[PDB]
Amino acid sequence: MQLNNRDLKSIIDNEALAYAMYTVENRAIPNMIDGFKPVQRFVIARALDLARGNKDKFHKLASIAGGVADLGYHHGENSAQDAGALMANTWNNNFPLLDGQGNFGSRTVQKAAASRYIFARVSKNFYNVYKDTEYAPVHQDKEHIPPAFYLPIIPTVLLNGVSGIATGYATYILPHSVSSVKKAVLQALQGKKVTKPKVEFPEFRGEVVEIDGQYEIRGTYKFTSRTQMHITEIPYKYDRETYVSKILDPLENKGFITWDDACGEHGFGFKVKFRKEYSLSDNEEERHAKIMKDFGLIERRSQNITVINEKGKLQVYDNVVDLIKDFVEVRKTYVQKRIDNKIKETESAFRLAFAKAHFIKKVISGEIVVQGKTRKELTEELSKIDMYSSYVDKLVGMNIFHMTSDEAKKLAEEAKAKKEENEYWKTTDVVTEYTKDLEEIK
Amino acid sequence: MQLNNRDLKSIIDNEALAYAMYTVENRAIPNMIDGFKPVQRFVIARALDLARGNKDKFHKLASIAGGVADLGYHHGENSAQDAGALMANTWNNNFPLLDGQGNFGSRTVQKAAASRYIFARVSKNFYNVYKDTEYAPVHQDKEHIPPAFYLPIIPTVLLNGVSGIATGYATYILPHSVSSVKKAVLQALQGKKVTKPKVEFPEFRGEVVEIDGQYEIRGTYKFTSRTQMHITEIPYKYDRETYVSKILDPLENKGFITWDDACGEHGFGFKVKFRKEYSLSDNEEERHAKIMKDFGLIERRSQNITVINEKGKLQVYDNVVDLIKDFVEVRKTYVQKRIDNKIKETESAFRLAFAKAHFIKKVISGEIVVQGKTRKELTEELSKIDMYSSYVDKLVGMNIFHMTSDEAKKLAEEAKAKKEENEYWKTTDVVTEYTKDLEEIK
Amino acid sequence: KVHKHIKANLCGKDADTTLFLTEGDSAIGYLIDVRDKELHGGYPLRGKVLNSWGMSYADMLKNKELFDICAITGLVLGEKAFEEKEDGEWFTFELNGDTIIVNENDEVQINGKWITVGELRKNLMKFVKIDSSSVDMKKYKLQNNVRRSIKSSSMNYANVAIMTDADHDGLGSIYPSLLGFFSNWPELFEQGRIRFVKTPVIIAQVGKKQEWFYTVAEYESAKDALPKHSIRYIKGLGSLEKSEYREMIQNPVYDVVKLPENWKELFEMLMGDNADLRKEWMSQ
Amino acid sequence: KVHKHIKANLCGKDADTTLFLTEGDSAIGYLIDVRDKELHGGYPLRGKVLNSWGMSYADMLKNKELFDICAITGLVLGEKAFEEKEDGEWFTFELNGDTIIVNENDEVQINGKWITVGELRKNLMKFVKIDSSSVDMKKYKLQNNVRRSIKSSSMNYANVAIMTDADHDGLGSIYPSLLGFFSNWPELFEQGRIRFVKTPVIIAQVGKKQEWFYTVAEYESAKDALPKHSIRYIKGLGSLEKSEYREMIQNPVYDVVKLPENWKELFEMLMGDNADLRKEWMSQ
DNA sequence: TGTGTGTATATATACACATATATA
DNA sequence: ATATATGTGTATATATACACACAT
Ligand SMILES: [Mg+2]
Ligand SMILES: [Mg+2]
Ligand SMILES: [Mg+2]
C-alpha cells in the first residue's frame, strides 16, 4: 500500500496530453517527407527486410505484419495487416509502394481478402523513387529500428491520398498525378514558378475541377435514348455496395427508376431505365442538374493539408503547392548530406584499396617475410607503424588468391576505380544529383 | 465452357478420402516418435529458426506463428497461434517444449492471453531431449521445410498429453511423468521387463487411481470442524468458471450449499459450508461417496492411444509400454544413422585438416611457391598432385595470417585431435551412446 | 433479399443463370468484375457447412448459410424444385454418329448449350418418330446430354455452380457437404444443374507458361515430369490474381455432378453418425 | 449476476472491498490467482470506454461496459452514491505535528489505512473539543487525510481502483474517459475512493535486480542514466507479467483522484464537442 | 441424448478521434 | 441543427466438423 494523492489537472496535463499528442504524431498525420504514417513505415520497413534476400518474392501479408513487433511497433498486428493491405492496391493508390498477389480489393468492393490469402512485396515504385534509405535519420528511441522517415525523390504524401484523424487535429489530402508532382518538384529544383499539382484519382475516368478552393468530383453519364441512361462513372467515394444501397435502392423502392448492373471491367456501368413517375423536363441544364443531384454523381471534397514537418511537429499548409517548396528544400540538404557521406566513404575505400595493393606488393617482394614469425609479433612488426598501419588487421586477414599475379594488378585496378569514383563524387553538385535522380522516374 | 459429368462415387472416393486421410495424418493424430500434430512441429521449426541468433530471446506469438506458411503450413495463422499458446505453458504440459513470458493462462483460467501480448521461445527441455535435428527424415514434399518428424530421445507424446479428433479416428493420451518415461525407455534400451509408466498431471495435487485401463482422477476435501470444509483440489477437467457455473452455482440456488472462493496461489480453494437442507449423515462411506459425486471431485479418463507410426500410417496401441518399445526400436536406428554420419563427417574433416597442415608445412618452407603465379596454373598444379585435388578450396581458405607461426602448431593440434574424435566415433555403439545421452536428462 | 447476394440481371427470368457459392467474402471480391453481368450470381458461405445429413427441415433451416441458399435460389425443403413436361411423342436422331432418343419436349446439350427439340426440328435435322412402347428407357436415361424441359420452376436461378477453394477442406468437408445438402433435390442432379467450378489448387508456372493443377494429387503425379518451376499453392480463392480469376470464370471447367443408384448409402457413409463406416471406407 | 465478473468474498458487505476494472480478459487472467480472495473484485472492460460527457442517463446505460460497471459497483446514475453521517461534535488533534480538525464521525487515513474517529479516541490520542461555529470549514475541506464516515450506502465495493494497460491508449484515452464517467457521482473523488493501480509500462533488468518504469515519460527521463538496460516494453496490463502481477497486486501503488474546483471545465475541454479547446490545449 | 477436447473453414461487433459535406 | 464517413488503434466474439467415452 502506497496511497498517494493525485489531482485531475496533473492527470490530464501529463497522461491525457501525452496520448492526445501521441495520436497526432503517431496514429495519424503522415510525415511530409516520408508520406507514411508510422504503421505504414513499419510495414514497409519489414517488407524491405523480407525482400533483402530476394526482392521479387511475394511474402504473406501475415508475414509482413507480426514481425513488425520487433522493429518497434507495439500496437497490435491487426492494424499493421490492415495498413499493409491498403498500400498494395492500385484502385486506392495512384503510386503504390507495395505490390500485391491476390484479391487486394477493387473499386467496386473496397475490401481486401483476409491476410491468410493475399501476398505483398515492395513494388518497383518504391525502389524507383525512394533513395538514400541508409542516410535516413535515426529515431530517438533505440527500439524504433526503422528510421525517422525515408527519403522519396518526390513527395509521396501528395500521391496516393491520406485521411488521418487525431485528437484535436485531422488531415485529408487528395491524390495527385505522379507526372504533375514530378514537374512541380523539378520546377522547384530549378527555382522557377511552380505549377500546382493536378488532382487525379487512381482508376477513375471522370472530371475533377477546382471551384473556389474546393474539389468537385463528378461522374459521367450519357443517354442512349429518350428514357435510357448509362452511368459510365461514379464519384470516387462510392463502392458498388454503398452506391447501390444509397442511391439505387431508395430510387427503386420509391418506384422512380429501374436499374440494371453492368459493373464490368470498365469500372461501374449501371444502366438506368426511367419510368413516367420520374421528371424528364426537356430543359438540358435542368435535366443534367436533376440527374447529377438524384444520382449522387457529384461529390465535393476540400483538402485539409496537415502533415508532420522534418522536425517531427504538426504543421498545417494552405496552398496545395506548399509542401513541395519545403520538401524540395529539405531534400536538397539531405542529398547534400548523402553526397558528403559518399565522398567520405569513397575516400576511405580508396585509401584501404591503395594500402591493400601496397601491402600485396611489399609481401610478394620479400620485404615482409610472413614465414617464421608469430602472428602477434608480425602484427606488431613492420605491418604496424607505417602507412597501412591503420588497416593492419584487415591486411592480416587477407585470403590467398592475392599473392598471385592474376589479382595483383586487379587490386591496383580497384584502387584506381575507387579514386576515380571519389573524384566523381567531389566533382558534383546537389542540384545536378537531384535532377539526375529525377530522370529515373519515367 | 466445359461440362464434364462427374459421378458422386468418384467425388467421395477421391476428394473426401483425401480430406479424411489428411485430417487423420497431417492434421490431428500425433506422430508416435515426435508427439507433434503437424501444426506444432511447424511452430517449433519456426521458433528454432528465430532462435538461431539469440537462444534466450523471447519472440512474440504473432512472430512465431506468423511466417510459418513459408515453411509449408497450408492453413491460417490463427490456428498456429492457438497451437503455440497451448504448448508454451506449464499448467497443462508435463514437459514444456516452448518457454514463454506473459499470461499463458492457468488452471483457474484455462485460456491464454491474446496473441498480441504473450511471447514464447524454445525451452531448455526441447534442447535437452530433441537431438539430431539435422539427421531427421526429409519430408517428401519439397515445400515442407521442417523434417518429416523431429527426433526426440524420450517419447514426448506420452509426456504432455495429446488429444485430437480427425475424420473416422480420434486419439487421447494421458500425461505421463518424465521421471518414469525415462525409466521405461532405459528398460527398453537395456532389454528387460518394461515397467508401466505413471500418469502424472501438471500442477495437480490429488490421486490418480487406475483400475483397468480406466483412470479415476480424484480430488480432495477436508472437514474443518463439523460442517465447513475446504475443497483443496478439484479434478483436472474443471476450469474455475466451468466449475463454479457447473457445480457450485447449481448448488447454491437449490438450498443445498453455500460457498466462498479461496483459490489462492497454490490452486483451487473453494471453501464450502452446508446448510440444514442436506442428505448428510454420520456414516463415513456414504458421506464420502455423496461428497465426491455431488461436487464432481472424481473424473474418469480412458486412454485411446492413436498415433502415426514412423512410416506415416495410423497405428492404434493397446498400452503405453508397446508404444515405448516401438519408439525405442525406431530411435535405435536413428542413433546408428547419427553414428555413421558422424563417422563420415569426421573422416572428411580429418582429411581436410591434414591437407591444410601439409599445405602450411610445404609452403612456409618454400616448396609450393605461389609468387609470380595466377589462379589457373596454381589450381592445376595443386590438382595434379595427389591428396590436394579433392579440396582445392583449402588453397584459398587458408588466408595470409595462416602463413605464420603460432598457427601451424595450432592447426596440427587440431588435425591430431580430429583423429582422436574420429576414433571416438568409430568405437561407440548405439546402446552406450544412447545411455550416455539419457544420463544428461534431469 | 439477403445481404451478400450479387443478383444477376435475369435472375427471376427464364435464362441460363448461374449462382456461385464461394465459401467466404474473400473469394467474391474479384468475382464482381468478371461476371457475365447477365447470367452469373454469387453468395459467400461461412466456412465449413453444417452437416445437413439426417436433421429435420426445421433444424435444417436454422443455419444462416443454408437458409440464405434456400432464399436465394428459391429451393424450399420438402417440396420438389421443378416439374417436368408430360411425356409425348418420342423422336430418335443421330447426333455426332450416335443414336439419341428424345421426346418432343427435351433439351439437348450441344457445344455447351442446351437446344430445344423444336429448335432442332426447325434446323432441318432428320427426326424418326418411334412408338413410346418401343423406346429404350434405360438408354434414354443414360444420356448425359439429354434432359427434359421443365413446365414450371421456382428456382430463381437455373444453375448452382459450387465454387469453393481447392484446399483439402474446401474439396472434402465443404464440397461434399453442399453436395449432401443439395441431395434433398435430386432433380437438380438429374438435370445436370449442380456443378463444381474447377479452381486450381496449384499454379506452377515454367518459363513463361503457367500450368494449372486442380488437385494436390494431380500435382504430385506431375511433380517429377514438369521442368523446374516455382509452385504457387493458393490456399483460398482470394489468393488468385484478377487475370487468373477472369480466365477461370469466363472459361470455366465445370464438373456436372450426377448421383449413382446408391447415393443415399454413399452419403450416409461419409456424413452419418457412424464412425465404423468411415473406418472401413478409409482403410481401403 | 455478471458472467464476466470475479466477485469478491466480502463484496456487498462492510469492508475495504476493491474493484479492479481492467480493459480485457487478457489483463485479468492472473488476478484470480494473486488477488486478495477476501476483499478484491474484478470486471474487465472491452477496449476503449464510450465518451460519456454531456450524455443523458439513458444512452449511458447502452454501452455494455458502462451499465455493467453500474451493476457491479451498485451505483445508479442521478442518485448520490451514499448518504454521509449527520454532523455532530468536532474534535482537533495534532497528527504527525500537523493540526487536523475533524468531527466525531469521520475517518482518518493513516499509513494507508482508514481509521474511525472513535478508534483513534480509544487509542490514547488527545482530542480537543471545539465548538462547531468555531470550526474552519475551508480548512476541513482541504484535508485529504480525513473523510466522513458513511451512514448508509449501496456501493458494493468501497473502492473503484482502476487498472489499465500502461501504454498511451490505456493511460490517456481510457483512464480519463472512466474518470469522466465516474464524475457523474462527484463524491467518489472526495473520500479517496477512486484510485489508479499503477502498472509498469517498461521493465528493465539492470544487473540481477528488476527496475520498473510506470510511464514512458518517466522512462524517457533516465534512459541515458542506467547501466546495460534491455527493456521489455509492457503493453498488456496483465498479459506480459507472470510474477510481477502478484507483486504489483499484493503491494499496489494506488493514486487517488481528487477533483479540483474547475473539474467540469477540464472534463469539457478534454471530453467535449468543441475541438478548438483541445487545439488551444495541446498547443501550450 | 449431450457437452467437451483442438485443429481447421470462414465471418463479425462496439468504442474514440474532427471536419467538411449532405440533411433537417 | 443533426448524420456520417474516413483510418489507426482498444478489446472481444461468433457458427461448424470430427470421435470417443463418461454422464444421463
Ligand atoms: Mg474464401
Ligand atoms: Mg490488457
Ligand atoms: Mg491498453
PDB file of N, CA, C and O in Angstrom, chain A residues 48-79:
ATOM      1  N   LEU A  48      10.833  -4.487 -46.644  1.00  0.00           N
ATOM      2  CA  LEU A  48      12.202  -4.374 -47.138  1.00  0.00           C
ATOM      3  C   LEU A  48      13.113  -5.406 -46.487  1.00  0.00           C
ATOM      4  O   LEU A  48      13.974  -5.994 -47.151  1.00  0.00           O
ATOM      5  N   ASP A  49      12.942  -5.636 -45.182  1.00  0.00           N
ATOM      6  CA  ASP A  49      13.741  -6.652 -44.504  1.00  0.00           C
ATOM      7  C   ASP A  49      13.512  -8.027 -45.117  1.00  0.00           C
ATOM      8  O   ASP A  49      14.459  -8.798 -45.308  1.00  0.00           O
ATOM      9  N   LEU A  50      12.255  -8.354 -45.420  1.00  0.00           N
ATOM     10  CA  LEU A  50      11.947  -9.633 -46.051  1.00  0.00           C
ATOM     11  C   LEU A  50      12.508  -9.710 -47.466  1.00  0.00           C
ATOM     12  O   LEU A  50      13.043 -10.747 -47.871  1.00  0.00           O
ATOM     13  N   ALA A  51      12.397  -8.625 -48.230  1.00  0.00           N
ATOM     14  CA  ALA A  51      12.825  -8.626 -49.621  1.00  0.00           C
ATOM     15  C   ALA A  51      14.328  -8.460 -49.783  1.00  0.00           C
ATOM     16  O   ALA A  51      14.817  -8.515 -50.917  1.00  0.00           O
ATOM     17  N   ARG A  52      15.061  -8.227 -48.692  1.00  0.00           N
ATOM     18  CA  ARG A  52      16.517  -8.148 -48.778  1.00  0.00           C
ATOM     19  C   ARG A  52      17.107  -9.375 -49.460  1.00  0.00           C
ATOM     20  O   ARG A  52      17.990  -9.254 -50.318  1.00  0.00           O
ATOM     21  N   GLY A  53      16.637 -10.568 -49.092  1.00  0.00           N
ATOM     22  CA  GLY A  53      17.149 -11.775 -49.720  1.00  0.00           C
ATOM     23  C   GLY A  53      16.792 -11.870 -51.192  1.00  0.00           C
ATOM     24  O   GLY A  53      17.633 -12.226 -52.021  1.00  0.00           O
ATOM     25  N   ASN A  54      15.547 -11.548 -51.536  1.00  0.00           N
ATOM     26  CA  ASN A  54      15.082 -11.623 -52.920  1.00  0.00           C
ATOM     27  C   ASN A  54      13.899 -10.681 -53.071  1.00  0.00           C
ATOM     28  O   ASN A  54      12.833 -10.936 -52.502  1.00  0.00           O
ATOM     29  N   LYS A  55      14.079  -9.606 -53.837  1.00  0.00           N
ATOM     30  CA  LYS A  55      13.060  -8.569 -53.935  1.00  0.00           C
ATOM     31  C   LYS A  55      11.859  -8.980 -54.772  1.00  0.00           C
ATOM     32  O   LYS A  55      10.820  -8.316 -54.692  1.00  0.00           O
ATOM     33  N   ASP A  56      11.968 -10.039 -55.566  1.00  0.00           N
ATOM     34  CA  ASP A  56      10.877 -10.467 -56.430  1.00  0.00           C
ATOM     35  C   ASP A  56       9.949 -11.473 -55.765  1.00  0.00           C
ATOM     36  O   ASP A  56       8.943 -11.856 -56.367  1.00  0.00           O
ATOM     37  N   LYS A  57      10.254 -11.902 -54.545  1.00  0.00           N
ATOM     38  CA  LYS A  57       9.457 -12.907 -53.861  1.00  0.00           C
ATOM     39  C   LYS A  57       8.281 -12.245 -53.159  1.00  0.00           C
ATOM     40  O   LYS A  57       8.450 -11.230 -52.477  1.00  0.00           O
ATOM     41  N   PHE A  58       7.094 -12.819 -53.332  1.00  0.00           N
ATOM     42  CA  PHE A  58       5.895 -12.345 -52.657  1.00  0.00           C
ATOM     43  C   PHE A  58       5.815 -12.968 -51.272  1.00  0.00           C
ATOM     44  O   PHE A  58       5.936 -14.188 -51.127  1.00  0.00           O
ATOM     45  N   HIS A  59       5.610 -12.132 -50.260  1.00  0.00           N
ATOM     46  CA  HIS A  59       5.505 -12.575 -48.879  1.00  0.00           C
ATOM     47  C   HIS A  59       4.077 -12.398 -48.386  1.00  0.00           C
ATOM     48  O   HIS A  59       3.393 -11.445 -48.771  1.00  0.00           O
ATOM     49  N   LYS A  60       3.629 -13.323 -47.537  1.00  0.00           N
ATOM     50  CA  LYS A  60       2.289 -13.235 -46.975  1.00  0.00           C
ATOM     51  C   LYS A  60       2.120 -11.937 -46.206  1.00  0.00           C
ATOM     52  O   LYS A  60       3.048 -11.464 -45.545  1.00  0.00           O
ATOM     53  N   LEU A  61       0.924 -11.357 -46.296  1.00  0.00           N
ATOM     54  CA  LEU A  61       0.647 -10.134 -45.552  1.00  0.00           C
ATOM     55  C   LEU A  61       0.703 -10.393 -44.052  1.00  0.00           C
ATOM     56  O   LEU A  61       0.987  -9.485 -43.263  1.00  0.00           O
ATOM     57  N   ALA A  62       0.433 -11.632 -43.640  1.00  0.00           N
ATOM     58  CA  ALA A  62       0.646 -12.000 -42.246  1.00  0.00           C
ATOM     59  C   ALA A  62       2.129 -11.998 -41.902  1.00  0.00           C
ATOM     60  O   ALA A  62       2.505 -11.730 -40.757  1.00  0.00           O
ATOM     61  N   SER A  63       2.985 -12.307 -42.878  1.00  0.00           N
ATOM     62  CA  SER A  63       4.423 -12.290 -42.631  1.00  0.00           C
ATOM     63  C   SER A  63       4.960 -10.864 -42.604  1.00  0.00           C
ATOM     64  O   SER A  63       5.916 -10.568 -41.880  1.00  0.00           O
ATOM     65  N   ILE A  64       4.367  -9.969 -43.400  1.00  0.00           N
ATOM     66  CA  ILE A  64       4.731  -8.556 -43.328  1.00  0.00           C
ATOM     67  C   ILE A  64       4.388  -7.993 -41.955  1.00  0.00           C
ATOM     68  O   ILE A  64       5.165  -7.237 -41.365  1.00  0.00           O
ATOM     69  N   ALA A  65       3.216  -8.340 -41.434  1.00  0.00           N
ATOM     70  CA  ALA A  65       2.865  -7.999 -40.063  1.00  0.00           C
ATOM     71  C   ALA A  65       3.498  -9.022 -39.125  1.00  0.00           C
ATOM     72  O   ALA A  65       4.315  -9.852 -39.531  1.00  0.00           O
ATOM     73  N   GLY A  66       3.138  -8.974 -37.848  1.00  0.00           N
ATOM     74  CA  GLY A  66       3.684  -9.924 -36.900  1.00  0.00           C
ATOM     75  C   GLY A  66       5.135  -9.646 -36.576  1.00  0.00           C
ATOM     76  O   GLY A  66       5.498  -9.463 -35.409  1.00  0.00           O
ATOM     77  N   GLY A  67       5.977  -9.610 -37.607  1.00  0.00           N
ATOM     78  CA  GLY A  67       7.381  -9.307 -37.391  1.00  0.00           C
ATOM     79  C   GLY A  67       7.641  -7.823 -37.218  1.00  0.00           C
ATOM     80  O   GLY A  67       8.780  -7.406 -37.002  1.00  0.00           O
ATOM     81  N   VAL A  68       6.594  -7.004 -37.327  1.00  0.00           N
ATOM     82  CA  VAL A  68       6.715  -5.563 -37.133  1.00  0.00           C
ATOM     83  C   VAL A  68       6.891  -5.261 -35.651  1.00  0.00           C
ATOM     84  O   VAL A  68       7.315  -4.162 -35.279  1.00  0.00           O
ATOM     85  N   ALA A  69       6.563  -6.233 -34.799  1.00  0.00           N
ATOM     86  CA  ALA A  69       6.629  -6.015 -33.358  1.00  0.00           C
ATOM     87  C   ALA A  69       8.053  -5.746 -32.893  1.00  0.00           C
ATOM     88  O   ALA A  69       8.277  -4.907 -32.013  1.00  0.00           O
ATOM     89  N   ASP A  70       9.032  -6.454 -33.461  1.00  0.00           N
ATOM     90  CA  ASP A  70      10.409  -6.272 -33.017  1.00  0.00           C
ATOM     91  C   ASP A  70      10.997  -4.957 -33.514  1.00  0.00           C
ATOM     92  O   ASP A  70      11.880  -4.388 -32.863  1.00  0.00           O
ATOM     93  N   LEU A  71      10.523  -4.461 -34.660  1.00  0.00           N
ATOM     94  CA  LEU A  71      11.029  -3.207 -35.201  1.00  0.00           C
ATOM     95  C   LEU A  71      10.633  -2.007 -34.353  1.00  0.00           C
ATOM     96  O   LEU A  71      11.227  -0.936 -34.505  1.00  0.00           O
ATOM     97  N   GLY A  72       9.648  -2.156 -33.472  1.00  0.00           N
ATOM     98  CA  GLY A  72       9.263  -1.079 -32.582  1.00  0.00           C
ATOM     99  C   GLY A  72       7.816  -0.654 -32.710  1.00  0.00           C
ATOM    100  O   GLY A  72       7.467   0.480 -32.375  1.00  0.00           O
ATOM    101  N   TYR A  73       6.964  -1.551 -33.193  1.00  0.00           N
ATOM    102  CA  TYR A  73       5.544  -1.272 -33.390  1.00  0.00           C
ATOM    103  C   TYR A  73       4.765  -2.061 -32.343  1.00  0.00           C
ATOM    104  O   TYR A  73       4.373  -3.206 -32.568  1.00  0.00           O
ATOM    105  N   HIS A  74       4.553  -1.441 -31.190  1.00  0.00           N
ATOM    106  CA  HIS A  74       3.851  -2.074 -30.075  1.00  0.00           C
ATOM    107  C   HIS A  74       2.389  -1.633 -30.028  1.00  0.00           C
ATOM    108  O   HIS A  74       1.931  -1.008 -29.074  1.00  0.00           O
ATOM    109  N   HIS A  75       1.644  -1.971 -31.085  1.00  0.00           N
ATOM    110  CA  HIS A  75       0.253  -1.544 -31.179  1.00  0.00           C
ATOM    111  C   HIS A  75      -0.651  -2.608 -31.790  1.00  0.00           C
ATOM    112  O   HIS A  75      -1.658  -2.274 -32.423  1.00  0.00           O
ATOM    113  N   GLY A  76      -0.320  -3.885 -31.631  1.00  0.00           N
ATOM    114  CA  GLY A  76      -1.172  -4.931 -32.167  1.00  0.00           C
ATOM    115  C   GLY A  76      -1.009  -5.105 -33.661  1.00  0.00           C
ATOM    116  O   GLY A  76      -0.915  -4.118 -34.394  1.00  0.00           O
ATOM    117  N   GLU A  77      -0.996  -6.348 -34.133  1.00  0.00           N
ATOM    118  CA  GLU A  77      -0.624  -6.642 -35.511  1.00  0.00           C
ATOM    119  C   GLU A  77      -1.784  -6.554 -36.496  1.00  0.00           C
ATOM    120  O   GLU A  77      -1.541  -6.514 -37.708  1.00  0.00           O
ATOM    121  N   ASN A  78      -3.029  -6.523 -36.018  1.00  0.00           N
ATOM    122  CA  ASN A  78      -4.158  -6.397 -36.931  1.00  0.00           C
ATOM    123  C   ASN A  78      -4.135  -5.056 -37.651  1.00  0.00           C
ATOM    124  O   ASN A  78      -4.425  -4.979 -38.851  1.00  0.00           O
ATOM    125  N   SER A  79      -3.796  -3.985 -36.931  1.00  0.00           N
ATOM    126  CA  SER A  79      -3.691  -2.675 -37.562  1.00  0.00           C
ATOM    127  C   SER A  79      -2.583  -2.659 -38.604  1.00  0.00           C
ATOM    128  O   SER A  79      -2.731  -2.043 -39.665  1.00  0.00           O
TER     129      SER A  79
END
